Symmetry: none
Subunit: 171 residues, 4 copies
């Protein structure tokens, strides 16, 4: 358990992630959930997606210098949700104006002309569900697309195309 029914999340110890060092904490009942993409390479197997998460964190830790991978959760097309900063550590993912008031979830890969498979979309929503259930996400949580809050191309034309569908998407 991770208390309630938390839609199968892969713990850090499992994708061989480097120890975090982030100390800033999210004031908890979070309201917004910004959705993005990594614009990087994608993976369709648990093995390649654990090697892929690794690739993203190392770039964030070793190269850019941050305390840990900046997303709170990474979603692979292997239908699995990878753990990042978790439901409590404020993540660096949408800018200073949004990082402390929202959870950040990123779909691994670049979705300009490519749509993520149903299992990712499913894994994603299922991850939000265990969010409310946990008491980290207000049942009245609002999902904004990365574009919506920053001058950016992500989460890809196609991936942004679908998030507009979600019962919680917002203007």
């Amino acid at each position: 358990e991770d208390p309630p029914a938390c839609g199968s999340i892969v713990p850090r110890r499992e994708w061989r992630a480097l120890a975090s060092e982030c100390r800033e904490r999210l004031t908890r009942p979070v309201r917004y959930v910004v959705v993005s993409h990594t614009a990087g390479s994608h993976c369709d197997t648990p093995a390649s997606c654990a090697q892929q998460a690794q690739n993203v964190q190392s770039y964030h830790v070793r190269n850019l210098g941050w305390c840990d991978v900046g997303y709170n959760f990474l979603i692979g097309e292997d239908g699995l949700v990878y753990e990042g900063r978790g439901w409590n550590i404020k993540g660096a993912h949408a800018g200073p104006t949004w990082n402390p008031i929202s959870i950040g979830i990123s779909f691994m890969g670049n979705y300009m002309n490519r749509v993520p498979p149903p299992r990712a979309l499913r894994a994603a929503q299922n991850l939000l569900a265990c969010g409310v259930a946990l008491g980290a996400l207000r049942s009245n949580y609002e999902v904004k697309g990365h574009r919506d809050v920053q001058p950016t191309l992500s989460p890809g034309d196609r991936l942004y195309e679908i998030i507009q569908t979600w019962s919680h998407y917002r203007a």
Copy 2:
């Protein structure tokens, strides 16, 4: 009326199962969950396990002439749960004295001397978790080994050896 953060399941319409011919139902809160293996080939990709599902369902349908895949849910080493007969229909999985009062989930593989991967064990636990939230299983469901309800090595020595540690395993 009552859905608390269930979990994510791969729909038959995705692993392309055949049409179910079963029309017999399980009476709702179900009290027992029987765990078993298929003593078949494992698979560690959403792709491969979309076939292993079929292999199992067709063997059951085409060769034993059953109305559908035997178990209510199949579980892959890929870390995803495959929908079998689901929470509503009675599956054929552990003798006539046990089939009408239990949910039968089965890890796809011959776990005689092979422990299933963490993500798989995680998949199953979470599945039963959804079970409760959804309301199909009692809050006090009782996970029982296959070999506990009838004469077989199933669900494999090492897999059985592992489920006895589960919070809901019983006598």
Copy 3:
């Protein structure tokens, strides 16, 4: 084979018992008998008792959500023995360590400051005789006080005094 009759037990059928869902079994011969009371309200007629018998059961299956009334037999001031889980299925009456190895007869009522009418005593002391002849009980079974194996006042204070008198009472 020796018309072993002592059968004069009201059968589940007769007191309108809800169908049991219990399936684990004792092993005959069974060596111990734990005597408890229900600390509940007493009845003294085949009518008012098949009433209480139904009540004690709804409390065990409807409230505590158990697979059936927890005792193996219920004695009534009406002088009759009411079938509970019976001689073969293991009840839920004295805890993890005794439940597996013992039958649990319980007197319907609260014997903290009353002595069960002779009918009840005769009824029970006779019920044991049955267990013996049929084989359910070791010819030399040992009787225990509910409070003997669990922190409680059961089987009542004066009723407790009385059983310590029985031939088969053990330490």
Copy 4:
């Protein structure tokens, strides 16, 4: 700011308990608390209760054969909490289904027709506030009546009426 600030519990070695013999560990945060009552004699002086506490202990330890006073914490009408088997050791107080996912606090006495003094009602609540501040009790724990999970009158018809009023009582 926010330091331990736990209320105060009488240590084991102050009321003289025998050495504990238990090794089974609770897994914390624990989310359920089951409120029981010894159903025995009350006390109202740090002297009489410290005595009463060991009575209860010998009974569970030498009589029943158990490894230590069944409960995790005993509440005295003297306004003081007596350390039972503590915050992290599995107790024997509500059968095999709850003993491992709950903490067991018992009010020394019998409240079937006697309301516990306010001090008592404040010592037990203060203890709970403590258990949350120490991360022993999940922040959103639920209080259950001993009788809501097992067949018994415990904690007492009036004490039971008292706790249902509680902000965490959730049957």
